[PDB]
Structure 1
Amino acid sequence: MYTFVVRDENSSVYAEVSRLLLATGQWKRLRKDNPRFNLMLGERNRLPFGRLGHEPGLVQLVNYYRGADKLCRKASLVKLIKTSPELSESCTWFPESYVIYPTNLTDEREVFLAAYNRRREGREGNVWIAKSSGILISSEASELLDFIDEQGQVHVIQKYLEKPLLLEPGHRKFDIRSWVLVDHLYNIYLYREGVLRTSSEPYNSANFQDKTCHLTNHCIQKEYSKNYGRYEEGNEMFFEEFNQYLMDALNTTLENSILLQIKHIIRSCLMCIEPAISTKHLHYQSFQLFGFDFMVDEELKVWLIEVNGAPACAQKLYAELCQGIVDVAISSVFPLAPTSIFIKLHHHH
């Protein structure tokens, strides 16, 4: 009989994972403060990694890689790409970004303005975006820096994709969410199912004020947009439909024009930090589900927007994925008495 504890009640993912575990009859949940556990569904912030792997007889497993925040933080991600030779500052799949500390607190204010005055001088598109861990889109550098000083937390300004790939009909923006699971062996598995969180408003490049056609967030489209649910159900187009579209319209497949780059980007990021977060020779073991967000330009080039370390899942895919998390992440470490739903990304450990 395997045992587990739950330290994140707000997790829709591992809530269903806990539902499936008990459904097997071979798992038993414990109070969130019981140290004798096989598996910890730990909290988001301040997970006590230092108390793991010190229970004699109990092999202990947790669903969070200690140190992955370096990859799942706006300012941390940028700092990781500009400093890691494996990614290099010349990384071609990550928008030109800079870390900007508000003036009420290193900081890349001057480095950002240099590349700005260059673009503004070369007649080139000089639209940028500012965000943090409240977003502002503007073409003038004065409005971006003034917006961060009004706050009190670190911000990041990166190039805004002026030429996104729009779905027809609708002339609308979108972003692709791919779920990636890394197990204790550090095998990289890509869930065969993705989701396109699409905008129901025609993309308008001459007005970055109305952030309804530029931001594809599932909450902003369902709160500030007026065409929500028009084309696809809940502004969520799955890989089956999006693939058929790329064929009829563009005469290519989601595999060739987009997925190859997505799998290349997922490999480069995770293989990069492997020496820092791997639990190969650790007294405890780690796995973690990641949520990658990508953009696509009219040239069918993929760009990395951010990585989410505690992502939620599309309503239509909670069963398949959660059952998959148990097969490859939990049963592979605590077996029970296909056609895998994942795409292994082999690499040189």
Structure 2
Amino acid sequence: MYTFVVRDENSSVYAEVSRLLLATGQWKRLRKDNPRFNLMLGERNRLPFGRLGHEPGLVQLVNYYRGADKLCRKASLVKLIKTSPELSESCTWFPESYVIYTDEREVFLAAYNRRREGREGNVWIAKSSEGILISSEASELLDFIDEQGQVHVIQKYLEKPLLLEPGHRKFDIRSWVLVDHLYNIYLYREGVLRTSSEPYNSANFQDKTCHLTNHCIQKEYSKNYGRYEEGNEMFFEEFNQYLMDALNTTLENSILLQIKHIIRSCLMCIEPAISTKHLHYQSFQLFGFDFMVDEELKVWLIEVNGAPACAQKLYAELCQGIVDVAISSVFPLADTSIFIKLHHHHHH
């Protein structure tokens, strides 16, 4: 009998992982505060990594990577991309971004000025880790940021997104990645497109229901929520069919290659900082990567989410995959794959 504790009640994903573990008859759940567990489904903040791996007679495993926040908070992600040679300031798949409360405010306006100088489109979006402003006026960016309290990032708004027809609408792609205790990188074969149900209007950035594809803001402010697909959620079979029908390509060739490239780059970059290869406790973690596709079929990384929920029709399959490859790999049960393993060894 393996044992585990549950310390994040609000987790859609691990609520289901828990229930699945029970239903095997080989996993006993324990009180939140009992230390004699094999598996910690931990809290989201101030998880006590320092207390793990000191129980004699217990291989211990936790569902978070200490240090993963560097990827999963937008300010740190910008810092990580700019300062790491393995990603670089030259990186082609991350939008131009600056951290604003070192602070890079003057660095921001110098590149903005050749936009003014260059007859380039120059709208930017300001976000933090509600509170999103899109505008081609720097003055209104920095004005907005400080009557709020905390750190913000200013990122170039992608002016020419790929728009689905019918609808002339926007979308983003959510990819679910599971990294196991051996640092294999598994991409769940099902993604989801979080669609806008409103037509994209390049002329009014003050209205954000055609500019923000978050599932809540469409369930909230938008006339046409659900018009084209269930819950503004187009899955991969349909999106592939559309790309074949409309653009004469596949999802694999035009978008997924880049997504896999970006996922491996990000994760192989922080691997030395967070790997548990020879640690006294071990880690896995589920990430959600958010991507945008411009009209040239170029993929851009938006942000990385350290505590993602799933799409409701995918919970069952994903969560069985977590227990399969992340939990039973370490703790086997008594006597094809939904994941794509991301590995690539080019010799040069």
Deviation per CA, 1:241-300: give whole Å up to 9, x if none. 000000000000000000000000000000000000000010000000000000000000
Whole-angstrom CA distance in 1 between matches of 2:243 and 2:77: 31
Match of residue 146 from structure 1: 143
Alpha-carbon deviation of 1:153? 0.2
Whole-angstrom CA distance in 2 between matches of 1:348 and 1:197: 37
RMSD: 1.5
Match of residue 270 from structure 1: 267
Gaps of 5+ in 2: none
Following TM superposition, where does structure 1 have runs of at least 4 consecutive aligned residues deviating by more than 2 angstroms? Answer: 346-349
- Structure 1 240/30 Cα, relative in aligned 2: closer, same or farther at 3 Å? same
Match of residue 172 from structure 2: 175
Whole-angstrom CA distance in 1 between matches of 2:326 and 2:346: 18
Deviation per CA, 1:107-155: give whole Å up to 9, x if none. 0000000000111111100000001011000010000000001011000
Return 24-33 or 337-346, whichever deviates more. 337-346
- Structure 1 347/63 Cα, relative in aligned 2: closer, same or farther at 3 Å? farther
Whole-angstrom CA distance in 1 between matches of 2:116 and 2:15: 50
Deviation per CA, 1:53-107: give whole Å up to 9, x if none. 0000000000000000000001000000000000011100000000001xxxx00
Deviation per CA, 1:11-70: give whole Å up to 9, x if none. 000000001000000000000000000000000000000000000000000000000000
Find out whether 1:39 has 2:39 as its counterpart.
Answer: yes
Deviation per CA, 1:166-224: give whole Å up to 9, x if none. 00000000000000000000000000000000000000000001100000000000001
Whole-angstrom CA distance in 2 between matches of 1:75 and 1:129: 14
TM-score by length of 2: 0.98
Match of residue 27 from structure 2: 27
- The 5-angstrom pairing of residues 75-154 of structure 1 reads 75-101=75-101, 106-133=102-129, 134-154=131-151
- Structure 1 308/201 Cα, relative in aligned 2: closer, same or farther at 3 Å? same
Q: Secondary structure at the match of 1:332?
A: coil
Whole-angstrom CA distance in 1 between matches of 2:115 and 2:231: 38
- Structure 1 347/275 Cα, relative in aligned 2: closer, same or farther at 3 Å? farther
Alpha-carbon deviation of 1:347? 9.0
Whole-angstrom CA distance in 2 between matches of 1:142 and 1:293: 28
Q: Secondary structure at the match of 1:306?
A: strand
Deviation per CA, 1:278-336: give whole Å up to 9, x if none. 00010000000000000000000000000000000000000000000000000000000
Q: Secondary structure at the match of 2:72?
A: coil
- Structure 1 325/197 Cα, relative in aligned 2: closer, same or farther at 3 Å? same
Alpha-carbon deviation of 1:348? 10
Whole-angstrom CA distance in 2 between matches of 1:338 and 1:313: 30
- The 5-angstrom pairing of residues 159-198 of structure 1 reads 159-198=156-195
Q: Secondary structure at the match of 1:312?
A: coil
Alpha-carbon deviation of 1:341? 0.2
Return 338-347 or 300-309, whichever deviates more. 338-347
- Structure 1 199/338 Cα, relative in aligned 2: closer, same or farther at 3 Å? farther
Q: Secondary structure at the match of 1:291?
A: strand
Whole-angstrom CA distance in 2 between matches of 1:237 and 1:348: 38
Whole-angstrom CA distance in 2 between matches of 1:282 and 1:233: 44
Alpha-carbon deviation of 1:338? 16
Q: Secondary structure at the match of 2:169?
A: coil
Whole-angstrom CA distance in 1 between matches of 2:62 and 2:157: 37
Match of residue 17 from structure 2: 17
- Structure 1 166/189 Cα, relative in aligned 2: closer, same or farther at 3 Å? same
Gaps of 5+ in 1: none
